[PDB]
């Protein structure tokens, strides 16, 4: 009854979804074949909950997911890999040619040839569910598909569904690190097109996770598998309130009424405190106060920003494991009196608390340690206004000389659409300066 559909777009989306569904299968006892021998231990078990999996009469558990990608290189690896029997064989491929880091091809030219299948599968999955609580769309700014196809699909879903929640998980471009020359253009066009369709778009930066892996986990040569595992842990911490039971369960629909004050400002940061390897799992207490303090440190942020250069607007702390409300209240009281962690003058409450009794899982062959308790912080703050501005500085430098523009106009776009995508973003920046000034009377 608490179900929610997941969609993944592009290479980044598919590779994050691999880790996400590996984690879900590990947590709920489902094997890669889709079976569930956990019923042997307890008769009539419900470990493979109906939130993320659909059960057939034969004992299988097919996942609720729609993997879509233009190029046939990542989905084929899933069809050949070890999870080939888990997913429904309707993993959608255009199978012809990639978007080539072009927003126009992902939106106008090639995206229009495959969107109908996506909508049909989403309709079937929605009709299977009794009442779905929202959509979880995984993508990444900078890629052609991740921008264009995500924007097109969100537009069509808002036309079709509307009031249903639509949350995002996006890999924002880093200020210095990058792997694409035309990435600022795609990011700017995406934020223009997908500002009035989403409801809460979480952001993640690759450079921040690299720094976290270097400092805490002590991995000097990480790859994308570790980043995907950390993002999987974030999403599992978010969704733990639906599958299991706890003292305070935060539903998906209650995220919005506690994190977004105004409709346009819906870009919060996400952080995971107890990132510790098995070697340093010892010599540490890992109490509620310690993890709560670690969540607010600049060094443990998963998005490259300095919260000290801005004011926190809202915070939502989702705990897991052995946690008592008194310890959480003590941690919040300790945090509030600190003068470095500022808050807006129009939010005396500030924090939302959620507690769940299921501890975090551990994937074999990973690097995260087994911890009794964990916490995930989702914070809406004004530091993000810096991260936009840098990207805007990368836009105006290139658009001034009209560089890399002939591809976009040659694949069905007008130059003016660029300028709008700047101006709207500028307005958003102004909003983040209009909601930081202290009130007067």
């Amino acid at each position: 009854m608490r179900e929610c559909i997941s969609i993944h777009v592009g290479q980044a989306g598919v590779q994050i979804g691999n880790a996400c569904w590996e984690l879900y299968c590990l947590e709920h006892g489902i094997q890669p074949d889709g079976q569930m021998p956990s019923d042997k231990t307890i008769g009539g078990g419900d470990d493979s909950f109906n939130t993320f999996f659909s059960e057939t009469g034969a004992g299988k558990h097919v996942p609720r997911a729609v993997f879509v990608d233009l190029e046939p290189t990542v989905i084929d690896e899933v069809r050949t890999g070890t999870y080939r029997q888990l997913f429904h064989p309707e993993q959608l491929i255009t199978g012809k040619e990639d978007a080539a880091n072009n927003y126009a091809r992902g939106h106008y030219t090639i995206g229009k040839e495959i969107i109908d299948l996506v909508l049909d599968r989403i309709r079937k999955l929605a009709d299977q569910c009794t009442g779905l609580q929202g959509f979880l769309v995984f993508h990444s700014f900078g890629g052609g598909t991740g921008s264009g196809f995500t924007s097109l699909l969100m537009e069509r879903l808002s036309v079709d569904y509307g009031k249903k929640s639509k949350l995002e998980f996006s890999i924002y471009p880093a200020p210095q690190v990058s792997t694409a020359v035309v990435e600022p253009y795609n990011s700017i066009l995406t934020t223009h097109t997908t500002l009035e369709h989403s409801d809460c778009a979480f952001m993640v930066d690759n450079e921040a996770i690299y720094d976290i892996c270097r400092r805490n986990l002590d991995i000097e040569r990480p790859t994308y598998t570790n980043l995907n595992r950390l993002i999987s842990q974030i999403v599992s911490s978010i969704t733990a309130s639906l599958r299991f039971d706890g003292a305070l369960n935060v539903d998906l629909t209650e995220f919005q009424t506690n994190l977004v004050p105004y409709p346009r400002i819906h870009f919060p940061l996400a952080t995971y405190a107890p990132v510790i390897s098995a070697e340093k799992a010892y010599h540490e207490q890992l109490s509620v106060a310690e993890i709560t303090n670690a969540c607010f440190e600049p060094a443990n942020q998963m998005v490259k920003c300095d919260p000290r250069h801005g004011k926190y607007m809202a915070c939502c702390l989702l705990y897991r494991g052995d946690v008592v409300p008194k310890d959480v209240n003590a941690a919040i009281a300790t945090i509030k009196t600190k003068r470095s962690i500022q808050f807006v003058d129009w939010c005396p409450t500030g924090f939302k608390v959620g507690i769940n009794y299921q501890p975090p899982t551990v994937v074999p062959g990973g690097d995260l340690a087994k911890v009794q308790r964990a916490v995930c912080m989702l914070s809406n703050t004004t530091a993000i206004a810096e991260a936009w501005a840098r990207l805007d500085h990368k836009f105006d430098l290139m658009y001034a000389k009209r560089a890399f523009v002939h591809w976009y106009v040659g694949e069905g776009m007008e130059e003016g659409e660029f300028s709008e995508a700047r101006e709207d973003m500028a307005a958003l920046e102004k909003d983040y300066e209009e909601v930081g000034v202290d009130s007067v009377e």
Binding site: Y108, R402, V409, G410, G412, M413, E415, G416, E417, S419
Partner: protein
């Protein structure tokens, strides 16, 4: 010896479909949406939140005579007295660029009126000096030049070339020498008939190729003068295609390729105008990005002056590309040009 580039603006009247909704729905408050442009005077201009200045603007109720008298006289007078001058249209789909520059047999455009006045001036000056004319008419489509007067020639043979003097000259171009206004009307009508267009859409008058008409005027003495008064000159009328967004056309076939090439050519023209306007980008102006800007090498800033007629719409849906046209017009107004006399035979 230098001249000044010229810019003018025109706006169409509401169509029947939008005007009907305007009278029904939005008239009560005062889709038939509100008037964004709201022209404030003859020279300046206002938009929803800003203000600009262009030369000799026109309202939706303006007449052909007013625009002809306000844009063409310097070009006509210069071209007849040697020199060089041109005119070219700009804007987006549905802004009426093919109506003002060409017109209909009952609503004639700038071409008919300016060439008829040239013929009348030739008749008037016949007692003084003899004048002859030559004509050519071509289109640019999908990065290919096509001749609208000799369609049998293939696009393979049509190619632009230049010598050490850097003078543009098209090969195998059909240069036609007329004798009367009826003949040139026949040529113009046949060329417009053979123009590439999209009759699939409801607006079958939609042009999907850049049309270029070139008229050369030459002079010669009457009675007994010995190798005097040659004084050739060139004039060109250019009709560009629109920059319709792909969002406005869900169905996409060969029209996709046509629109892509049209937008690439328009972007090349915009880059050329921006390069010319900027002081320190004068080291090189990218004329070679498309055939269109290559053919207008001398027209832009080489040895000639031109009139940029930008066409807009009053519908509220048409906002962003109208602003793009306004910005590009502003920089097109800031480019200079030189002007020199013609060769004399001896």
């Amino acid at each position: 010896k230098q001249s000044s580039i010229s810019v003018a603006v025109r706006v169409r009247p509401f169509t029947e479909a939008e005007s009907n909704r305007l009278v029904k729905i939005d008239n009560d408050d005062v889709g038939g949406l509100r008037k964004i442009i709201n022209v404030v005077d003859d020279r300046m201009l206002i938009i929803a939140s800003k203000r600009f200045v262009f030369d000799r603007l026109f309202d939706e109720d303006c007449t052909q005579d007013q625009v002809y008298r306000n844009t063409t006289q310097p070009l006509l007078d210069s071209v007849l007295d040697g020199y060089n001058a041109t005119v070219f249209a700009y804007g987006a789909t549905g802004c009426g660029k093919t109506h003002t520059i060409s017109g209909t047999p009952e609503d004639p455009g700038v071409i008919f009126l300016t060439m008829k006045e040239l013929y009348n001036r030739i008749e008037e000056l016949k007692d003084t000096k003899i004048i002859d004319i030559s004509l050519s008419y071509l289109e640019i489509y999908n990065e290919t030049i096509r001749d609208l007067l000799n369609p049998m020639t293939q696009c393979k043979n049509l190619v632009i070339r230049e010598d050490a003097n850097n003078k543009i000259s098209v090969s195998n171009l059909s240069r036609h020498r007329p004798n009367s206004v009826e003949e040139v009307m026949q040529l113009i009508l046949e060329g417009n008939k053979n123009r590439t267009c999209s009759p699939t859409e409801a607006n079958a008058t939609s042009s999907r190729s850049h049309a270029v008409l070139q008229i050369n005027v030459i002079q010669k003495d009457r009675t007994g003068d010995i190798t005097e008064e040659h004084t050739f000159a060139t004039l060109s009328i250019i009709d560009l295609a629109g920059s319709e967004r792909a969002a406005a056309t869900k169905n996409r076939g060969a029209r996709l390729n046509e629109g892509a090439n049209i937008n690439k050519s328009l972007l090349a023209l915009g880059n050329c105008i921006n390069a010319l306007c900027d002081p320190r980008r004068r080291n090189h102006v990218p004329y070679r990005d498309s055939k269109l800007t290559r053919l207008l090498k001398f027209s832009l800033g080489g040895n000639c002056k031109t009139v940029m007629i930008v066409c807009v719409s009053p519908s509220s849906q048409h906002y962003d590309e109208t602003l793009n046209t306004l910005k590009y017009a502003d920089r097109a107004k800031e480019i200079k040009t030189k002007l020199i006399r013609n060769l004399e035979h001896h």
